[PDB]
Write a protein that binds this ligand. Sequence first.
Ligand SMILES: Cn1c(C(=O)NCCO)c(Br)c2c3c(c(-c4ccccc4Cl)cc21)C(=O)NC3=O
Ligand SMILES: [Cl-]
Length: 258
Amino acid sequence: SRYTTEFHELEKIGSGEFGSVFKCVKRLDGCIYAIKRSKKPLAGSVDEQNALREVYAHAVLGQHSHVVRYFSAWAEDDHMLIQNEYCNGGSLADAISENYRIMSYFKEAELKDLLLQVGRGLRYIHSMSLVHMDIKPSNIFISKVMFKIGDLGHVTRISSPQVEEGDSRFLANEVLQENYTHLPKADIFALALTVVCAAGAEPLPRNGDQWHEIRQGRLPRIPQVLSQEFTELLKVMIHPDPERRPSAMALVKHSVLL
Ligand SMILES: Cn1c(C(=O)NCCO)c(Br)c2c3c(c(-c4ccccc4Cl)cc21)C(=O)NC3=O
Ligand SMILES: [Cl-]
């Protein structure tokens, strides 16, 4: 086996339904990588196509500072593996839980900077005529800290007529209602919520009354003082009218981000 023969497995850092993720050192280049090892879905089936799109997307989103680099992907003999860049600072999710336990969140300067960087990662993706569809703190990773979008498992072409939904906590309603005219804006919606989490909000709701309020374009309580301008940027990012949310390009050129 190539995984065993080419890498030294250091530690498990991720455990899913389908997969697992390991910190490993490539024996030949001495260098450390994150490798997701997951079940090989039956050749030529809906689930296979899902896994292949991930490999396809990683393979074209490899020039970017705000997307995790892909090094390789292979299959053996009942598993599928992808070898990506390892991010020494771990995930945005874990930084936010640590933050939450200590009552010390991302400051406004840090939140702008997270939004700008991830916004740059999205701009890129959208310019590759793709969309990510599952932006959330556990799919953002950290390496001046660099934030990098990871987990392209939901990535699809911008004008897809069929879509798998990302996490409901971060899901725009128009997508829930199978309206796929402005998918790039689904990522914009999720980015804002991600940044809301970064600011120290309570865990986001999955369903029920509070799930809908936000989808009306109402921000969750943020336990700290943010400038009105920045709060406005945030609000417009979760606007019920996806056309009213700024593209990623608008996002990174926004004055509040200069
Ligand atoms: C769960 N996880 C963690 C982690 O939580 N570490 C503990 C500290 O918080 C990292 Br870092 C990480 C990393 C990746 C993935 C991953 C996602 C989807 C598909 C394939 C992969 Cl390889 C999952 C990852 C990655 O690609 N690059 C990483 O650094
Ligand atoms: Cl998350």
